A paper describes a structure:
CYTOKININ RESPONSE1 (CRE1), the main cytokinin receptor, has a modular architecture composed of a cytokinin-binding CHASE (Cyclases/Histidine kinases Associated Sensory Extracellular) domain, followed by a transmembrane fragment, an intracellular histidine kinase (HK) domain, and a receiver domain (REC). Perception of cytokinin signaling involves (i) a hormone molecule binding to the CHASE domain, (ii) CRE1 autophosphorylation at a conserved His residue in the HK domain, followed by a phosphorelay to (iii) a conserved Asp residue in the REC domain, (iv) a histidine-containing phosphotransfer protein (HPt), and (v) a response regulator (RR). This work focuses on the crystal structures of the REC domain of CRE1 from the model plant Arabidopsis thaliana and from the model legume Medicago truncatula.
The structure of AtCRE1-REC was determined in two isomorphous variants of space group P21212 with two protein subunits (chains A and B) in the asymmetric unit forming a homodimer. The second structure of AtCRE1-REC (referred as AtCRE1-REC-K), determined at 2.15 Å resolution, corresponds to a construct with a 9-residue C-terminal truncation and has potassium instead of magnesium in the metal binding site. Its chain A is comprised of 134 residues, including Ala917 of the cloning linker, and chain B of 120 residues, including two residues of the linker (Asn916–Ala917). While chain A has the complete sequence (Leu918–Phe1048), chain B lacks 13 residues at the C-terminus (Glu1036–Phe1048). The structure contains 41 water molecules. In this paper, the AtCRE1-REC-K structure is mainly used for comparative analysis of the metal binding site. A similar octahedral coordination sphere of the same six oxygen atoms is found in the potassium complex of AtCRE1-REC. The K-O coordination bond lengths range from 2.56 to 2.68 Å. However, even though the potassium cation in the AtCRE1-REC-K structure has the largest radius among the three metal cations, its charge is only +1, which apparently is not sufficient to pull Asp1013 into the coordination sphere. Instead, there is a water molecule replacing the interaction of the Oδ atom of Asp1013.
Author numbering:
A (entry chain B): 916 to 1035
B (entry chain A): 916 to 1048
């Protein structure tokens, strides 16, 4: 509960800056981190059984986005449930930062002066 | 005498709940509020010269979104500056909540267990230096 020692985290992101920064953040608390740059690579790493304890899922990726990739992880797990009678549920947290920042850049680009924080 | 007393706010939003909430809230601070359901209505209300002190701009609207409408509010001001030399710069604040809500609803629908709001900050950020050749 204080450190991530003994945990293995999958970071999926198609931005090399995100992959490097997330991994260093998680490694500073002792996580073993594996990075994937695409949904296909992530699905290949998540063949059941795998040893990952949690996954950070970039929602915006070409060819397969994070929603699709998640849908297929859940299909993989449902298949395993049916054939092994054990329930696999990898924790998956979406990484949305790049949808929100892109949104803020179009606001500024269009000429808006700011935005409402925690808006109406 | 309340905080926005004497101020007139244009709320542009195509969702009736936001219009009702934004306007009620702003009126409690003493603002006179006008609501618009579309960018075209907003552009019509912002004929220069106008009496609006601020504008809240829904970024996601059919037919004309808030970026477009903003883009044309700025052309109006630039045209005025060019032709009259008078400086108009309406304050425009983006309303982005419903884009974040939809994204968050899509995460749930796909099967994710949650989301990270704030991005990963890097540790030694202001610790970098400019090194000279
Ligand atoms: K991305
Ligand atoms: K909207």
């Amino acid at each position: 509960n204080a450190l991530l020692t003994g945990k293995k985290i999958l970071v999926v992101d198609d931005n090399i800056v995100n992959r490097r920064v997330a991994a260093g953040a998680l490694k500073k608390f002792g996580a073993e981190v594996v990075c994937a740059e695409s949904g296909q690579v992530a699905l290949g790493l998540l063949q059941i059984p795998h040893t990952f304890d949690a996954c950070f899922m970039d929602i915006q990726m070409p060819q397969m986005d994070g929603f699709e990739a998640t849908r297929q992880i859940r299909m993989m797990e449902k298949e395993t449930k049916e054939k092994t009678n054990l329930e696999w549920h990898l924790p998956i947290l979406a990484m949305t930062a790049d949808v929100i920042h892109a949104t803020y850049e179009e606001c500024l680009k269009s000429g808006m002066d700011g935005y409402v924080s925690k808006p109406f």
